[PDB]
């Protein structure tokens, strides 16, 4: 469920449906479809078991995980827990090069 | 297990060396390990003990109790009969296997690395050596634990003075500073 992680849905073609997981942008998708030798196929996913297993094993060559979320969490956990001045404002969502916000909290929290 | 074997092999005749005991019955053993999740916040919301027991059941080999109140404190909003904390005693051979886990795994997995503070005296062979975090044990799940509280350990011996307990814990790992 489905083939790798969860929820690779049909009714869309292959480069579209693979974007739906935490770890695929578009360059990862085109490179993984280039590593097998496949195509758009077609506008509904009608792959074969050879093709699905090949593109299943090639994604396993990456960081494409649900622990990739945990990888991000341990990244920002390294961040916020040294001192940390970047943790104080990391939780207040302002970038480490600064953005100088007195009305740009509506991106994250919506103070209105 | 390991720690009865160390008592039979090396610990007892070294004790008869370093204190000149006239009989083997004079040697001090170890009796208990008492553990106390002192929550104190189930009075606010009762779902705080409901995971402290879940953590203690993994850490020990038992289930804890739920402790009563015996008083009625105005400041912490206490009456009689209030669920506050949870004891776990340990006897038998699960003493020594839990102590094996304590000597090997746990004590070197704490930040500000120093091991064991040397002042826990009480004069009479009891080193309450508390625990600050909860993530120390191998069986701790980051996907389950939220709060950053800690434990209690009450090492209980039959030793008279603390010169004896220091040598016992020196012959049972226990990284003093």
């Amino acid at each position: 469920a489905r083939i790798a992680g969860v929820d690779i849905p049909r009714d869309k073609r292959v480069v579209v449906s693979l974007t739906y997981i935490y770890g695929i942008g578009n360059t990862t998708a085109k490179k993984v479809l280039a590593n097998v030798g496949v195509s758009e196929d077609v506008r509904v996913r009608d792959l074969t078991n050879e093709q699905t297993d090949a593109i299943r094993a090639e994604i396993d060559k990456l960081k494409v995980e649900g622990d990739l979320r945990r990888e991000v969490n341990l990244n920002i956990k390294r961040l916020m827990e040294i001192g940390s001045y970047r943790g104080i404002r990391h939780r207040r969502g302002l970038p480490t090069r600064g953005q100088n916000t007195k009305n740009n909290a509506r991106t994250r929290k919506g103070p209105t | 297990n390991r720690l009865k074997e160390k008592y039979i092999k090396e610990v007892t005749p070294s004790l008869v060396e370093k204190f000149n005991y006239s009989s083997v019955m004079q040697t001090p053993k170890v009796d208990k390990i008492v553990i106390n999740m002192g929550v104190g916040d189930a009075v606010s919301n009762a779902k705080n003990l409901d995971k402290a027991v879940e953590e203690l059941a993994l850490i020990t080999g038992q289930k804890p109790l739920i402790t009563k109140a015996k008083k009625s404190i105005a400041g912490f909003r206490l009456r009689e009969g209030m669920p506050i904390g949870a004891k776990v005693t340990l006897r038998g051979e699960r003493m020594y296997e839990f102590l094996d886990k304590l000597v090997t795994v746990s004590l070197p997995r704490v930040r500000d690395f120093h091991g064991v503070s040397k002042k826990a005296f009480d004069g009479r062979g009891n080193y309450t050596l508390g625990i600050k975090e909860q993530l120390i044990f191998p069986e701790v799940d980051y996907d389950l634990v939220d709060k950053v509280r800690g434990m209690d350990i009450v090492i209980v011996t039959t030793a008279n003075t603390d010169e004896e307990s220091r040598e016992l814990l020196a012959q049972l790992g226990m990284p003093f500073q």
Partner: protein, 83 residues
């Protein structure tokens, strides 16, 4: 032991990332790999990163080329530039 109301336990043999101490027991479980006769015939999967020798309270001062990931994350990219 009072019946039915005590948690799960099996005497799980330890391992390590380095040198593999194989003596002890445990409580939690997994997929068994080396049921071992010289110890308890149980799981091996308690495979802790700590030997209680790796920390410099027992063996001595051994961290100069300690070469561990996040350590090398700074000390390899400019660490080749360092040395």
């Amino acid at each position: 032991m009072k019946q039915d109301i005590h948690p799960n336990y099996q005497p799980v043999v330890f391992m390590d990332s380095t040198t593999g101490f194989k003596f002890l027991s445990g409580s939690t479980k997994g997929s068994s790999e080396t049921v071992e006769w010289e110890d308890g015939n149980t799981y091996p999967l308690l495979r802790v990163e700590v030997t209680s020798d790796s920390h410099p309270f027992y063996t001595g001062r051994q961290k100069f080329t300690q070469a561990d990931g996040r350590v090398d994350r700074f000390n390899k990219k400019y660490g080749l530039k360092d040395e």
